[PDB]
């Protein structure tokens, strides 16, 4: 299959259909949805690899919104991409302004 041809889990077929239909352009090259699958796959993997670490670092087998929030907010680059995004049930990074701490 196409996804198999491209080295990918993400569906090069499905993606290709969303582009023609999704009012982006009149015509869609045969490359675009291969490339586009690859990039979505890459980004997906980086978050999961980072959030799967956050789970194991809390002795938990299933990834939860907090693990994603932590993965994402601690990664200078992922933070910036998702800078104006809200993760439901993510919570916020432990952090207390210095001048508030005692002494």
């Amino acid at each position: 299959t196409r996804s198999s041809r491209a080295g990918l889990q993400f569906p090069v077929g499905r993606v290709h259909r969303l582009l023609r239909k999704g009012n982006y352009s009149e015509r869609v090259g045969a490359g675009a949805p291969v490339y586009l699958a690859a990039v979505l796959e890459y980004l997906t993997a980086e978050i999961l690899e980072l959030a799967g670490n956050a789970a194991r670092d809390n002795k938990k087998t299933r990834i939860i919104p907090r693990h994603l929030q932590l993965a994402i907010r601690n990664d200078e680059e992922l933070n910036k991409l998702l800078g104006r995004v809200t993760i439901a049930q993510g919570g916020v990074l432990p952090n207390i302004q210095a001048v508030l701490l005692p002494k």
Binding site: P65, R84, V85, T86, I87, A88, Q89, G91, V92, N95, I96, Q97, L100
Partner: protein, 83 residues
Amino acid sequence: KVLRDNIQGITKPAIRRLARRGGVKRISGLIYEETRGVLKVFLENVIRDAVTYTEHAKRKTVTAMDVVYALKRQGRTLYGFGG
């Protein structure tokens, strides 16, 4: 009293808890009303758009999508309700 200004249902205790999670230590008394003001404008803006969606779709039931789509327009993109 206890009558139909549901905004007041937003208790000081709950306003305190937010500003905690937001690293706030010492909270002026005047703030719990300021916060209440600000929260309403927030909901007004989002809900007006979400229901504007609802009326366009010809429905009486506000969907979670309608909100999602509203929050995107307001620049407050929300993940995990149908994005």
